[PDB]
Design an enzyme around this catalytic site. Structure first.
Site, mmCIF file in Angstrom:
data_model
loop_
_atom_site.group_PDB
_atom_site.id
_atom_site.type_symbol
_atom_site.label_atom_id
_atom_site.label_comp_id
_atom_site.label_asym_id
_atom_site.label_seq_id
_atom_site.Cartn_x
_atom_site.Cartn_y
_atom_site.Cartn_z
ATOM 1 N N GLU A 272 0.809 -1.317 0.007
ATOM 2 C CA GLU A 272 0.042 -0.023 -0.042
ATOM 3 C C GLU A 272 1.089 1.379 -0.071
ATOM 4 O OE1 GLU A 272 -3.442 0.525 2.886
ATOM 5 O OE2 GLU A 272 -2.480 2.456 3.538
ATOM 6 N N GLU B 121 22.340 -19.695 -8.775
ATOM 7 C CA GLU B 121 22.995 -20.026 -9.938
ATOM 8 C C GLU B 121 24.343 -20.686 -9.575
ATOM 9 O OE1 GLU B 121 22.567 -16.418 -12.369
ATOM 10 O OE2 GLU B 121 20.296 -16.705 -12.547
#
Length: 515
Positions: free
Chosen positions: A182, A251
């Site tokens: 918000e 990775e």
């Protein structure tokens, strides 16, 4: 006169002023960048030089096009005044993605969330970040209680910034106050603005990436750390209910990557972690994807079967960076095909895809292949192919340290390509560069006899052919690394390769494919 580029940096209006008209060209002057001569310079070209041309296409078929959006691409200190011109930023506006009547991507992937305790990436393991975001009470607490918890590692760019994130005025508030959906500004606030314009748009967090995979092996082995990690996911998904996907871009399990701790056990340990996240029953989390190398040896090492057995729903196959400097041979960086005996272009999308489906028995529909918004170059390069128009790329280089790029040596980004290297409208290279189609790889490269710089890049033609490959092979779809680089030409080509009917036409792609 162009529908793809501006001839002068149009600048950026901020606080009722435009302080950066012509800024890109002032940098070029200060650094003595000249496209037809420079072999060893950085351009610092901002994406502002490109015109925005994303079409939209019906995307409710059995494929999806995903976008890695990086939270550092918004920056450019040239925007603020006239003081800084010897360097710059990409200035990539999140609002280029705000198309009418559809979306250029089904899913935006926030890149990247880091991990508390990651001392490869950060001298203090991101502890000061944790405090600033309000998830830890002091740096000791961050490490002692939250090792393995994900957080964005750039709170300015994630939740505070206005410029290039869709907001128009500075407002008071610290990162702790704004670290929820918000109240966010920054790129997460920008994601929210796109969410509000388009209810079908999906949002993923990518955790890790090449520079931030140093802590995964350690986390995945350890019950306590896995539990902190799952808490990290629950917390972020509670703070940002609009998110529905997770990309854990470790990775890579079982191999070296950027220089990480690694173990043969990594993939099996990662599968326990995946299951543990699933078990938390985070109501908004609908899917988890992982990263895979395109090198079959690294695929073997990752234990992909364990990960699919734990319910992973996507594999983002990192089909780019196939050209790495070091071995003195030129290579395509993101090519679909190669001859099996090719020692120049050693990897291909097809080799990797075939390996996953045939050897590892992965469901083809789980696989997403990459197209690239940037290049891999070498200066001092020689093309040795006998008939470049008909034969596979072969070539060599000597000293490629400090090779031409945009923001880092040896890598040009898409804006530079369309402004100074290739004229897709006229169908030919710019500034002494010529475009060659390699029919064996189905990939294009650029080369100047004058500068001796070799440039491996994706083009509309190759990205269209990647879309074609995905469709023929029944894959999940494609992702762009990274979408902030694209002015829309690459992504248009992807949708067209998927045979998608156009909905909103901003540009006719037809003449840009060159047969």
């Amino acid at each position: 006169k162009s529908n793809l580029i501006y001839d002068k940096d149009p600048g950026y209006v901020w606080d009722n002023k435009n302080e950066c008209e012509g800024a890109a060209e002032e940098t070029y002057q200060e650094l003595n960048y000249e496209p037809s001569i420079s072999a060893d310079k950085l351009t610092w070209t901002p994406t502002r030089l490109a015109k925005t041309v994303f079409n939209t296409y019906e995307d409710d078929d059995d494929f999806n096009v995903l976008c890695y959006f990086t939270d550092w691409s918004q920056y450019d200190p040239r925007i603020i005044n006239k003081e800084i011109r010897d360097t710059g930023g990409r200035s990539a506006d999140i609002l280029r993605l705000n198309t009418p009547d559809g979306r250029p991507f089904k899913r935006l992937i926030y890149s990247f969330g880091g991990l508390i305790g990651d001392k490869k990436y950060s001298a203090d393991g991101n502890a000061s970040i944790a405090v600033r975001l309000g998830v830890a009470t002091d740096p000791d607490d961050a490490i002692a209680n939250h090792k393995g918890k994900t957080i964005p590692v750039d709170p300015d760019g994630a939740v505070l910034a206005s410029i290039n994130c869709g907001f128009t005025k500075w407002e008071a508030g610290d990162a702790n106050e704004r670290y929820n959906q918000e109240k966010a500004k920054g790129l997460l606030g920008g994601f929210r603005l796109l969410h509000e314009a388009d209810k079908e748009l999906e949002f993923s967090l990518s955790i890790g990436g090449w520079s931030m995979s140093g802590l995964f092996s350690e986390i995945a082995k350890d019950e306590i750390l896995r539990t902190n990690f799952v808490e990290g996911i629950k917390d972020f998904f509670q703070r940002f209910p609009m998110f529905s996907h997770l990309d854990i871009d470790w990775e890579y399990p079982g191999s070296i990557g950027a220089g990480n701790p690694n173990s043969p056990d990594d993939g099996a340990n990662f599968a326990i972690l995946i299951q543990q996240i699933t078990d938390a029953k985070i109501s908004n989390l609908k899917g988890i994807s992982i990263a895979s190398s395109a090198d079959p040896a690294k695929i073997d090492a990752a234990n992909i079967p364990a990960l699919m057995d734990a319910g992973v729903t996507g594999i983002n196959l990192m089909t780019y960076d196939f050209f790495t400097l070091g071995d003195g041979k030129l290579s395509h960086h993101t090519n679909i095909y190669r001859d099996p005996s090719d020692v120049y272009s050693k990897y291909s999308i097809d080799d990797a895809v075939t390996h996953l489906i045939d050897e590892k028995k992965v469901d083809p529909k789980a696989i997403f292949i990459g197209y690239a918004g940037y290049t891999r170059n070498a200066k001092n390069a020689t093309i040795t192919t006998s008939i470049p128009s008909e034969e596979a790329l072969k070539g060599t280089y000597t000293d490629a340290n400090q090779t031409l790029g945009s923001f880092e040596y040896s890598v040009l980004e898409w804006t530079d390509i369309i402004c100074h290297y290739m004229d897709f409208e006229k169908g030919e290279g710019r500034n002494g560069y010529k475009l060659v189609h390699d029919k064996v790889a189905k990939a294009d490269y650029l080369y100047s006899e004058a500068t001796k710089v070799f440039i491996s890049l994706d083009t509309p033609r190759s990205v269209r052919d990647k879309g074609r490959y995905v469709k023929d092979k029944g894959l999940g779809g494609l992702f762009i690394w990274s979408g902030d680089q694209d002015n829309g030409i690459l992504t248009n080509a992807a949708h067209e390769g998927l045979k998608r009917r156009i909905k909103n036409k901003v540009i006719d792609m037809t003449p840009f494919y060159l047969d």
